[PDB]
Amino acid sequence: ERTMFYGKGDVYVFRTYANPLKGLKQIPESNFTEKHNTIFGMNAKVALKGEQLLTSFTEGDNSLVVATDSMKNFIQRHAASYEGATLEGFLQYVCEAFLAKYSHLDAVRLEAKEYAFDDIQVGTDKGVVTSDLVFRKSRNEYVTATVEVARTASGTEVVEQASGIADIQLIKVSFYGYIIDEYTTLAEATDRPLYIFLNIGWAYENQDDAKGDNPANYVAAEQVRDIAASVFHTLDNKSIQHLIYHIGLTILDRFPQLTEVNFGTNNRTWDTVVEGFKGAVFTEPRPPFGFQGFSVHQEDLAREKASANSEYVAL
Amino acid sequence: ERTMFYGKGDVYVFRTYANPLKGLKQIPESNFTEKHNTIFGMNAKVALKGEQLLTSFTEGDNSLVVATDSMKNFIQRHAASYEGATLEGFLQYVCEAFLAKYSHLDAVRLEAKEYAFDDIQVGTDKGVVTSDLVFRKSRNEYVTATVEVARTASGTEVVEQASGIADIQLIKVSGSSFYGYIIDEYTTLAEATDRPLYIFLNIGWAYENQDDAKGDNPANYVAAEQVRDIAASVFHTLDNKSIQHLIYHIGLTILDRFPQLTEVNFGTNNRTWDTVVEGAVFTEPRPPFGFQGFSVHQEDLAREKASANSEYVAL
Amino acid sequence: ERTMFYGKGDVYVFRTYANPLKGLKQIPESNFTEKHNTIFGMNAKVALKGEQLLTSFTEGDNSLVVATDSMKNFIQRHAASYEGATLEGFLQYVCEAFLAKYSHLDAVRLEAKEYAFDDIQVGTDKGVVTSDLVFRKSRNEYVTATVEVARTASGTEVVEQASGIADIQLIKVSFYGYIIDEYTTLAEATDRPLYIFLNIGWAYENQDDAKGDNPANYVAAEQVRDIAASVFHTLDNKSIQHLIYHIGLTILDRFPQLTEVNFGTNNRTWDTVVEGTDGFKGAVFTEPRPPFGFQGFSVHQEDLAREKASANSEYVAL
Amino acid sequence: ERTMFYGKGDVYVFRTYANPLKGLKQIPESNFTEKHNTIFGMNAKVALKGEQLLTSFTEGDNSLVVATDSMKNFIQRHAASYEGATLEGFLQYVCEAFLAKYSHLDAVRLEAKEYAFDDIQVGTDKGVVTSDLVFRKSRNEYVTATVEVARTASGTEVVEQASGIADIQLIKVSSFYGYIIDEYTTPLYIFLNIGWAYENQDDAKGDNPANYVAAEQVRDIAASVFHTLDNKSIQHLIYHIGLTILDRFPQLTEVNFGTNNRTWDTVVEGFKGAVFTEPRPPFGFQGFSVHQEDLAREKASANSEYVAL
């Protein structure tokens, strides 16, 4: 069962004026209901797979090798012909196109990181308004997706689909009961603002929903980001663990078409230098960071809603 | 003169609930008139100078050495006692405090890079509103400042003061030109009446009256956010003929809005996108970047306003 | 099948004067036979797992929660007590120790990236020699390892063991036959020096070999790096694909106790600006646009056996 | 007196088989006496200056603008024609060539960061030897240089020349006391950037390699002094590194330093059985220059503790 694949990474693709994403589900946690797609940009990574690639390694035979530069061209050209509005839709489109073109391949995997842009405010004769010409390149959180399509008995299918928002970094300016033993740090505890990094991902029950053909069924990463921020703001969390459980429940509650929500976190909380948070001064800690990995599923939500003592609440 | 200084860098200092910056000058290019300072954070770098530091190098004599760790403590404790609202004000406060404490120092230099946070929107029972609890760590543009103070016979004086906004990254999809340049055997670049323009801007300014940067009269304090908004507004409105042309007009506009400034300076970078599918689809270019250094002064603005040939316009 | 773990990352741990690794297998591709371990340093990442952690998430109950800071202390203290000489040995030692201490855990995973130091040459009254005092922090290739241990009904077992060398970046200052279609770039090809990034990993048939208790059976990442460089130097490769197959075969040949070698590559080859006047003499190159070729591949002992049984094999070793 | 320049950065330029640098001065701190230049690569950054560039900013008039893309082409082509062996020589050559081509320029500034490669050992039928074909891209310390050339009534002159080695990171597995104690008071690992200046700037061109100071030699001096000296601080250490460099290379007028203190925190006290970890981010730093006058004074002073191999 050998590992075998090859492809091209850092395939930057910037499509201008892609079809707008409109008609997303209205939720209390967010005002985000459309994504204009004036810039539809990403960093794409494609990998090709198939048993027929073996001799390209074992014999240096390039006869069945699609050149990696050609894969780059293929992706960039398909960005021009794509008529949809979502990252997942674009990746599925491209995967399927590779398989239609190259019969000797059996699977194609696309991973993408959004090359994100913010709308900005500019002063005009009409007052201060949102620019339709100039955008800020954002180095903050960005949308992610992965689609892998493989051949099936009848054609092809998505065998892996991931959607997410990466690099959310939030601090709240307003934890006890752990195991205590010989490994516990012998120093007094101080209160600091909880500072967290979150990567949040989700999975669809019907993967076609990720294509955005019916945007009422598409989950925009920006909505998930807004849910996470809203829950962080409102909940009196007992821990990051407890917080992400409630963020996940809320996402599943707003989007019943999702089967699960997953998290990867960092705790990045500052160290106290001067105790206050009025008048307080903090600084960066030593490098070690706490982290959590956790998935929440519809079964968890159904259990909470059926429970007599659940603490789960939603707007 | 010998080079000689020492200090502490990466002195992260995060003060919570500093005095709010309020009452900034209203300008057409911006709606930014206050900075709440719920988090007032920065990465500071301090350097001490003085002829009396020589033997710490030449003889390893630490007698007159303030430990760099002690400098860190000094800065962090002063972050708690500072009652002002601006980066420049804090830096000058600390410089003067070091000089008051340590008579053997001739000069103290503080540099700072803002540790920036964005306000975010959260869903509540009252609808979607700005959170006063949760903030996003921004990896986008950030405020900068430098203050160096030297001892004098009568007391102390500011020998350098700098203010800026760093790492503005903006794209303008279309409208910018680059043609008319030298065509010789080294020229392979095709002239363009319309090419995508991606700019990186660092903008700085100097005050005629340095105490203005302290923010004690905020009507005379120039917030970096206002400068950023002017830059974006000019980028939006001007049909630029190069980044050189663009930054001249940005500089003029800043000087126009803030007559109390003597100069605006630019350290800027430029990178077009390569076209891969003509309309469009673009991709990242090879590494080389254009760059520019330029300063604009009130004399330039006066010249432009009085000239029958000027193309300078302002809201 | 829920995802559920928590831990501490960027646990930098720098042990001085760990037991030296001595007595490695001599091979033609390498002079590396000992690693003195004057500095035995790494960036460690620990994850704790167990069904009993569930209510820490679902109820905010910290009762069975080992504090992440405590995990950091645990690792750092075990770095002082570890008597072995290998990264894999240390990671397994720590995993097992966590499980012995905390009965409510089902599994513990440790990952580590070496915090690498080079020996350097210094002038002294005896001439230019290797310093035993001063070392360069290296930002080049570095050793990697992962060990995950889980509880069983009758003790514990290793459920994952990984060993590797990361971030080898090599150029050779010395490819055709691809599919050609409408997606082919319509430009003439030029010859450039092949420039590759390699991450190489391996697995042991007998996992205890990784502990280094018999160093003759321990595969040092530095030896693997030296094999890779040597094969790159000698082989007339037909592609990166072809190259890594042969690097893998050679590693398997030298170390029969390995079951597989795996690769992750980048093609980082430059673009031509000025064609050389003769070979690469007088040539000038520059960095390409960002897109990079990559390959993922594993080579197994069965591959080596096939090559040795084949009349048409091109495989050769020193 | 406004600021005004423009140019191109991240101009990666990789020349293969440049003229080897051979015949460097033998010194006790180093075995480095030649640099083969099989790869002669750098990241170059060029800036052009000239009063006649004003209207390119003020009027958007590109008539006298050399496109930054063209500057890139200019540098890369001159890498093919350069026949010397040093970074400084290449930069001066390019600066002079820009000024010869474009009369309306007043000054040209080139900065470069070496794109460094290490020689490596490979096993062959002749045993383990240094490869002549395969090299490792080094992410460790690298050579730097800056040359800026401006016009004179009779031709051109160098108005700035800099040479250095950047990002040396060294730990010593083997003091700091006596500092001020007041209310603010509560395994040495150093980062070094070292630069130097020549009395006769033409020595940087390498036409007489006995007078060329290779950054690798300076690196070897720094390491050797770090190894041998019992330092009382990083400040004290860099003074002695600087004195030593000036001693070996009398043709240098000065050596300058930019440092970091990156020393670890102790977690388990030993250094047998000792365990350390990374500290919080704040780092000490120093800036300092040492001059030939300092060395002459040390070499005549009974108070001096300076020693060299």
Residue among C57, C244, C298 whose CB faces A241 most closely:
C57
Could you list the residues of A known to form a binding site for O2, using ranges. 68, 267
* C-alpha to C-alpha distance for B241 and B179, rounded to whole angstroms: 8
Tell if the CB–CB gap between B245 and D186 is shorter than 8 Å.
Answer: no
Q: Which residue type, as a one-letter code, is found at position C275?
A: E
Q: Contact B290/D6, CB-based, under 8 Å?
A: yes
Tokens 């000797």 belong to residue: A104
Q: Which of B58, B189, B262 to mutate to test the interface with D (most CBs of D within 10 A)?
A: B58
- Which amino acid, B125? D
Chain C nearest-CA residue for D138: C140
Question: Residue A176: what are its φ and ψ, rounded to 5°?
Answer: -140, 165
**C117-136 burial string, b = 16+ CB within 10 Å, else e?**
beebbbbeeeeeeebeebbb
Taking the CA atoms of residue D73, residue D75, residue D76 and residue D81 in that order, the dihedral angle to the nearest 10 degrees is: 120
CA atoms of B314 and B249, how far apart (whole Å):
9
**Residues in B touching C288 (Cβ below 8 Å):** 286
**CB contact D169 to C (< 8 Å):** yes
Residues of B in contact with A168 (CB under 8 A): 136
Inter-chain CB proximity A121 and B232 less than 8 Å: yes
Contact B142, B184 (CB under 8 A): no
Task: Give residue for tokens 């060029």.
Answer: D46
Residue with tokens 């992400």: A244
Subunit contact A29:B229, Cβ cutoff 8 A? no
User: For chain A, how long is the longest CA-to-CA vector?
Assistant: 70
Give me the residue label for tokens 């992965």.
Answer: A146
**Cα(D77)–Cα(D86) distance, rounded to whole angstroms?**
17
Taking the C-alpha atoms of residue A301 and residue C194, their distance in angstroms, rounded to an integer, is: 54
For chain B, the farthest-separated pair of C-alpha atoms sits apart, in whole angstroms, at 70
How far separated are the first and last CA of chain A, in Å rounded? 49
Mutate to test the interface with C, among B275, B277, B286, B289 (most CBs of C within 10 A): B286
In Å, what is the CA distance from A146 to each residue of A91, A157, A161, A294, D286?
A: 7, 14, 6, 19, 48
Give the integer Cα–Cα distance in Å for B173 and B192. Answer: 14
Distance CA D184, CA D177 (A): 15
The partner residues of D34 in beta bridges, in order of sequence, read D22
CATH number at residue C261: 3.10.270.10
Active site residues of B: 8, 68
Q: Is A185 on the interface with D (CB under 8 A)?
A: no
* Residue C192 assigned as binding residue: yes
The backbone torsions φ and ψ at residue C237, rounded to the nearest 5 degrees and listed phi first, read -75, 150
Q: Which residues touch D120 (CB under 8 Å, ≥6 apart)?
A: C170, C229, D130, D131, D134, D135, D136
Written as six digits, the tokens of D273 are: 């059985």
Residue bearing tokens 């407890």 = A242
From chain A, the residues in CB contact with C294 under 8 A are 6-9, 45, 47, 68
Chains that touch A (3 or more CB pairs under 8 A): B, C, D
Assign D252 to helix, strand or coil: strand
CB contact under 8 A, C286 and B285: no
Angle between helix axes A221-234 and A240-254 (nearest 10 degrees) is: 130
d(CA A92, CA A82): 11
- CA D283 from chain centre, in angstroms, equals 22
CA distance A268 to chain C (A): 11
Verify whether the Cβ–Cβ distance B6 to D287 is below 8 Å: yes
Q: Transcribe D19-76 into DSSP letters.
A: PPEE-PPP-TT----EE--SEEEEEEEEEEE-GGGHHHHHT---TT---HHHHHHHHH
Residue D280 contacts C where some CB pair is shorter than 8 Å: no
Kindly state whether C185 is in contact with chain D, defined as any CB-CB distance less than 8 angstroms: no
CB–CB contact A293 C5 (8 Å): yes
Rounded CA-CA distance C295/C293 in Å is 7
Task: Confirm if A305 and A252 have CB atoms less than 8 A apart.
Answer: no
Closest CA to C99 of C165, C30, C41, C148: C148
H helices, E strands: number in chain D: 6, 14
The answer, for D186 touching chain A at a CB cutoff of 8 Å, is no
* Three-class DSSP category at B88: helix
Residue B140: how many CB atoms within 10 A of its CB? 18
Q: Give the closest-approach CA distance of B171 to chain D in angstroms.
A: 19
Q: Which secondary structure element, helix H or strand E, spans residue B97, and what is its range? A: helix B87-101
The C residues from 9 to 28 touching A (CB cutoff 8 Å) are: 9-12
Contact C73 A184 (CB under 8 A): yes
CA atoms of D216 and D166, how far apart (whole Å)? 11
Question: Considering only alpha carbons, which residue of chain A is nearest residue C184?
Answer: A70
Place of tokens 């679902």: C58
Local structure of residue B67 (DSSP, 8 states) = P
| H runs (alpha helix) in chain D | 54-58, 68-81, 87-101, 215-228, 234-248, 292-298
Please state, in angstroms and rounded to a whole number, the distance separating the CA atoms of residues C285 and D101: 23
Of C11, C176, C242, the CB nearest to A288: C11
Q: Which range of residues forms the domain containing residue B227?
A: 1-315
Solving technique: X-ray
Query: Which amino acid is present at C54?
Result: L
Residue ranges of the annotated binding site of D for O2 are: 68, 261
C-alpha span between B42 and B111 (Å, rounded)? 10
Which of C247, C251, C249 minimizes the C-alpha distance to C239?
A: C247
Q: Are D91 and D79 in contact (CB under 8 A)?
A: no
Instruction: Give catalytic status of residue D101 as yes or no.
Output: no
| CA-wise closest residue to D85 among D77, D93, D95 | D93
Q: What angle do CA D69, D73, D76 make, to 5 degrees?
A: 135
Tokens matching residue D238: 């860099």
Please tell me which residue of chain A has the smallest CA distance to C71. A183
Residue D216 three-state SS? helix
B223 near B258, Cβ under 8 Å? no
Number of residues that make up chain D: 309
Q: For residue B12, give both structure tokens.
A: 């992260």
Instruction: In whole angstroms, give the CA distance from residue A89 to residue A87.
Output: 5
Q: How far is A199 from chain C (nearest CA, A)?
A: 14
Residues 6+ apart with CB under 8 A from D228: C122, C124
Q: Distance between CA atoms of C128 and C135, rounded to whole angstroms?
A: 15
What's the domain count of chain A? Answer: 1
| E strands in chain C | 4-16, 21-22, 34-35, 39-49, 107-114, 117-124, 127-137, 142-152, 155-172, 194-204, 258-267, 271-274, 284-286, 292-300
Contact predicate B14/B39, CB 8 Å? yes
Cβ–Cβ below 8 Å for C122 and D228: yes
Task: Supply the DSSP symbol for D204.
Answer: G
Q: A67: left (phi > 0), else alpha (psi -120 to 50), else beta?
A: beta
Token pair, residue D294, equals 């300092």
Catalytic pick among A8, A35, A113, A211 = A8
Answer whether B236's CB lies under 8 Å from A131's CB: yes
Helices B298-306 and B243-257: crossing angle in degrees, nearest 10, is 100
SS3 B130: strand
Widest distance between CA atoms in chain D: 70
Distance linking the first and last C-alpha atoms of chain B: 48
Which residues from C are below 8 Å from D120, CB to CB?
A: 170, 229
Q: CA-to-CA distance for C197 and C195, rounded, in angstroms?
A: 7
Q: How many CB atoms lie within 10 A of CB C79?
A: 28
Distances in Å between the alpha carbon of B254 and those of B242, D38, D189?
Answer: 19, 51, 45
| C-alpha–C-alpha distance, residues B171 and B174, integer Å | 9
Residue C32 sits at the vertex; the CA angle it makes with C26 and C35, to the nearest 5 degrees, is 120
D159-186 b/e (C-beta count within 10 Å ≥ 16 → b)? eebbbbbbbbbbbbbeebeebbeeebee
Q: Write down which chains contact chain B via at least 3 CB pairs under 8 A.
A: A, C, D
To test the contact with chain D by mutation, choose from C137, C165, C191, C268 the residue with the greatest count of D C-beta atoms within 10 A, namely C137
Which of D234, D232, D162, D145 has the alpha carbon at shortest distance from D198?
D162
CA-to-CA distance for B299 and B168, rounded, in angstroms?
Answer: 26
Instruction: Give the pairing of strands A258-267 and A271-274.
Output: unpaired
Tokens 């690693």 belong to C35
Q: Which residues contact A115 (CB under 8 A, 6 or more apart)?
A: A12, A14, A39, A41, A42, A43, A137, A142
Q: How far is CA D272 from CA C17, C37, C100, D268, in A?
A: 6, 12, 26, 10
Q: Using CB atoms, pick whichever of D10, D12, D169 lies closest to residue C136.
A: D169
Name residues 118-157 of chain C within 8 A of D (Cβ): 118, 120-125, 128, 131-140
What residues in C contact B274, CB-CB < 8 Å?
Answer: 289
State phi, psi for A173 to the nearest 5 degrees: -85, 35
Are C179 and A67 in contact by the 8 Å Cβ rule? The answer is: yes
Q: For residue B193, what is the DSSP state?
A: S
Q: Which of B3, B66, B109 to mutate to test the interface with D (most CBs of D within 10 A)?
A: B3
- Residues linked to residue B15 through DSSP beta bridges, in sequence order: A281, B40
Pick C238's closest partner by Cβ from A9, A60, A101: A60
> Mind spelling out the 3-state secondary structure of chain A?
CCCEEEEEEEEEEEEECCCCEECCCCCCCCCCCEECCCEEEEEEEEEEECHHHHHHHHCCCCCCCECHHHHHHHHHHHHHHCCCCCHHHHHHHHHHHHHHHCCCCCEEEEEEEECCEEEEEEEECCEEEEEEEEEEECCCCEEEEEEEEEECCCCEEEEEEEEEEEEEEEEECCCCCCECCCCCCCCCCCCCCEEEEEEEEEEECCHHHHHCCCHHHCCCHHHHHHHHHHHHHHCCCCCHHHHHHHHHHHHHHHCCCEEEEEEEEEECCCEEEECCCCCCEEECCCCCEEEEEEEEEHHHHHHHHHCCCCCCCCC
Residue window 237-266, chain D: list those with CB within 8 Å of chain A: 265
Residue A65 contacts C where some CB pair is shorter than 8 Å: yes
- In this structure, chain A runs to a length of 315
